[PDB]
Structure formats: C-alpha cells, structure tokens
Amino acid sequence: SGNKVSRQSVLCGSQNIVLNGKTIIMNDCIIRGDLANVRVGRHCVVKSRSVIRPPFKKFSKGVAFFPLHIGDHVFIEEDCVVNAAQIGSYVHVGKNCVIGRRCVLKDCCKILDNTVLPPETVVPPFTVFSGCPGLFSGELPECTQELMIDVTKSYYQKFLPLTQV
Amino acid sequence: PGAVVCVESEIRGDVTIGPRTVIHPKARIIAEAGPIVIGEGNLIEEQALIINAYPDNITPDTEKPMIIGTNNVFEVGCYSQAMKMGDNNVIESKAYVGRNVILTSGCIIGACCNLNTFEVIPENTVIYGADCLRRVQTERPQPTLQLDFLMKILPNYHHLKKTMKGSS
Amino acid sequence: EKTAVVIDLGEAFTKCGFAGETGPRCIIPSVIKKAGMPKPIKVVQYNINTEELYSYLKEFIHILYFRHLLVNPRDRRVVVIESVLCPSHFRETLTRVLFKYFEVPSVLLAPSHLMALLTLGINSAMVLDCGYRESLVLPIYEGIPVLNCWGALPLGGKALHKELETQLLEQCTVDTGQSLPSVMGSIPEGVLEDIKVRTCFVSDLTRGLKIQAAKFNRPSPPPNVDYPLDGEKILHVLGSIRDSVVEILFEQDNEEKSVATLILDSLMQCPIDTRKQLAENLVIIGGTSMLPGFLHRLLAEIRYLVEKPKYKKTLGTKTFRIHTPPAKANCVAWLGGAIFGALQDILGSRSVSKEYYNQTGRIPDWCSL
C-alpha cells in the first residue's frame, strides 16, 4: 500500500519479489526476480536506473548463492547495480555502485559513489567503503548517518505521494 | 532458432546469433551500420549496449561487422561498440569496449574497465578493473586453465539460462 | 616486556614496524590521501610553515599507527630513524608531534648509517645510502661516524625521475584513442616509479663507456618493450632511453662527481690508519641500490676510478669488498634500528624521554654546547 512503485519501473517475478512498507521504487528501475527472490526492507529508497538482479538460480548441487536482500532504511542511490548483496539495515549505497557475489554489507555502512564491492566481501559495521578495489576508508559516525537516513526517508515520502502513476 | 531472445530485449538491423545464445532483458542490439555476428553459447546480460561503427570508406576504412566469439560471457551493463572478440572472453559488468579492438581468446575484462580503441588485447590476460591496459594478473587466465574455466562458466551460464527459461 | 616502535621516515617511502621482528610489518608510501584534493601531498618536506608541517606529521602518524602497529605507542618506546643531515627544523617538528600531541614515553633521533652498520655486525665500515632526494656517504670507524669525511650529490631517485621525464618528452610514441608525440606535458610520479622498477636495465662498465662515447661522437641499443597506461593510451618506450637515464648517475665529466667518485672523496678525507678498514667494508644501502645489476656497475666504476692517476697517489692498491646485509638494500637502515631498540632496554636510557623534553626544550642535535 505505502510502497510507491513507479510506472516506468519494472518488477519481474512478483511472487519472488518483495517490497516492505513505506518503500520507494524510482523510475526506470529493474527488480528482476525471475530466477530468485528479492527482499526489500521497510522505508528503503531504490533510486532511478537501479538494476536489482537476482544473484543465482539457487539450483546448484553444492554452494548455491544467496538470491537477494535489503535491510530497513536502505538508501540505494541512482544507477546502482545491486546484485547478490545482503544489505544490512541503514546501508547507504553510493551512486553508480556495484555489489558482488555473496557480499555481506553490515549495519550502518556507507558505500562510496562509483564503488565496486567484490564477491564474498564482508564489509564491517560503521565503516566507509572506499577505493577502486574494495577497502576500509575510515570509521563513520552513528549520529550523522542516522540523521541523513531520516531526512532521505522524509523526502522520498513526499515524492511517493504525488506525480507517479 | 535455438537462442533465448527475451521479449523486453531490442534488436535492430542484421544480426545473426549462434546456437544456445542468451539475450537478457532490456539488452540493446543495434546493428544498423553493419551485420552483427554473435558466437555460439554467447550470453548477453541485461542493460547491454551492442553498437557498431560506420564502415566502408575507400581510404583507411573505419570498421567492419563486430564478430563476437563463442562462449563469450558479456556481463550486465556492458558496452561493446565495434570490438572484435575471441572465444571464451569474460567481459565484466559496466565495461566499455573501444571503437576498434582485437580481444584474444581466454580473456577476462575487469569491472568498470575502458577497453582500448585501436588496441589488440593479447591471448590469455585478465584486465584489472580500474586503470586501462594493466599487464599484471595473466597466469591464472592462461590458455589451458582459462579454457577449462570458460567451459565451466559456459556450463553455469547455460544451466542458469535453462533454469530461467524453465521459470519463464 | 615491551617491544618498541621503529620508524624510518623519507620523501618516497617509509619503513615502519616493531622492534625485534626480522623486517618491518608494512611500508606505506610517504604521501597522504586527503578528501577534496586533486593530487596526494608528500608528508616529508623542508622549508615550509611550522604549523602546517605539524598538522601534516599528525595526519601521517595517525594513519600509520592504526594500520601498521595496531596499538597506542603510549605504552612503549619509539625509534625515529632520521637520516643524518635531515634538517633540525624538521627534527624539532617531529619532536613536538611525538611529545605534545601523542605524548609518547620516549623517542630517539639516531642516524641511519650507524644502524645500517649494526645489521652487518662490524664496528668499522664505509657506508653509502642512495635514497630518493640525495645519495649520502658517511664512513664509520669503530662505532663513531667520521663526520667531516662525507659527500652527498643531488643524484638519487628524484634525479632519475627528472631524467626519465626529460627523455620520454623528447622521444615520445603514444597510441591513439599512431604518432602524436608530446600530447601530455607531464606524467604522474607513481607511474614513473613503476617504470623504473620494471623497465630500467642497468648497464655494465664497458657498455656505459660505449654509451658515453656515442653521446659525444649507438652500440648495444636493445632491448626495448612498451609500457601499458590507463585511459587507452599505451606508449612505446624505447630501450636506449632507459639505459641513458641510468647512465647519468655514473656520469663523471665536467662535474668531477658521481655515485662512485663520492666514495673515493669520502675515503680521501679520512685519515691514514682508518683508510684500509673502510675500503675493505664498503656497505651499499638505500632505494636506488635495489635496481637490477647495480652493485657490479658501482664496484667496476669504483675500481676504474682507482686506476686513474689522480687517485693512485693516495689510494693505490685496495681490496674493495662489498659485504652485503641480511635484509634487502632499501630496508637495512630500518633493521638496524629494530636491532638497537628490541634487544637493549639499557640503550633506551641514553635516548631522550618525555620528562627531559618538557623542562629542557629539545632533543640535542650534533651542534655546539
């Protein structure tokens, strides 16, 4: 009900796909859950041109990859190729980002713009991601990240209300 | 026939795809300039932009039809605007092929990698994602081992595409 | 009880780790990464504002001890391996940052050549440290460094970088994105370091003389290989160029000076009884000495200079042996400081403490009073 899905956005595999309350799918989004399921958290803002593709078929005899996930208050930036990443709640994904195979994003993370998280890259909680090759830039503040996520959730709710159908 | 062409995917001009080819959703295959040629078992992922270079000038002709090799794993969001490719070449996501190229067999392009215009990539050499033309890391991508790895990658791609085709 | 910290600062690189461990834990370059900055700024600089340097040193030390050491240096001692003739202004700034900001228990500003001598385990040696900025000579005899016998030409890493930048700009061959020479005016330092490590082949004495003869009125030009570069602009670098860049390090004429001649000038200044032991124990350390096929070209050039009439009348027949160290050529100075700090809790007492710094004023540099 509360989830504002855009008209230009596409959600392939509706049974596999999953959208929590107060969600926001921007225009030209692609939540392709044909092969596997895609779980979106509450108050999660998926920005425009975001390719939400399923990680694996989940039909492998041994060591099948985890399909998709997204914690609450997840600020997914525009043009972000989210694939096979278990995003912890309050994860701030950067613009033009790229998630790897079975990448574990921790709580209160801050992915930089134009980043590339590699396969099986376990990011630590309260830490800014940086570099061309994934690495720890520095420890992030708890109060500043929570305030920015609250402001982003309020702004997305206003755009969710009007001008989309 | 015998190629998984998606409904959302777009094709234009002459385009002869090989056997067991997989065209993913929202994939552009603009072959208006010249007749496109996709190899057998070549997987084109979603949001991919297959372009061609306008060709046939008498003195120093610019290009010819972009011939993709067999078992070529083109990742999602990959640009391939007029680049000659070899068999068993794994182009990563968000990549960009040059205006003219010669990608040899057993390749492995990195993510967010700008492949060179008028540059022939050597046989058996994995490209680092960021700064172009990185010579390092070409041992594990050697002719013998890379052929076995690409055969395993082609099997996983065919198995995943078969599961996707079964789901519909 | 307490393993002390070891630091070895410099303009290009910085060796750092724990005292006692055979070789350092890590070696991050001297530059720092700042938010909202086009290029990375070097930490170790001279002749520049005091408060700015203080902030630059704090910024480098902060990024260091978390990544390198994984500990607070407030528990245990530190060994700051300053190269001798490192400006007193820069030492005072280091002393301020270590005591005022961080509040360490103790510090030490000991020389690099004496510690590099502690690695060999001999009391007398002629030493040469070819770093980034300068190529410093300093003979040690029976522990004490003989100070007035010395030499340091501006002919280290930075001189080789400048020559590479000059010669590549004169003869350039970049691919399209073929021709098009001298498109880009300059090139970055990190790339130019990687070119020196990989491409630059050091020539022999006979090859070097043939190159010098060719420059002033061509033999053995090969081999040549291209170097890959970012943004789809591969440049076809030549084989005669990189050999010519290496040759200027050993160029005698019109200065009467080179890396080889600097040892002979240092030996000339030394007294007669000291002379023979320094000649027997000729140690080579530093960054430039890591280049492939360097120690022959030096030893052969040294011998050729001794054969010349001007050095026969003083030096004459001498057994020039190059006793090499346990660790690599760049990381000899650090290993000596690690030996000095780890073993002796006694020799930690001679160094300056926090209690002594506050009341007095400064660590004593080799000066008056």
Ligand SMILES: Nc1ncnc2c1ncn2[C@@H]1O[C@H](COP(=O)(O)OP(=O)(O)O)[C@@H](O)[C@H]1O
């Ligand atoms: N493994 C190596 N092979 C060849 N050259 C090297 C190597 N490591 C460092 N260098 C060169 O040596 C220089 C480093 O000098 P360094 O010993 O750090 O001087 P300082 O300690 O005075 O800063 C650099 O300019 C670099 O080009």
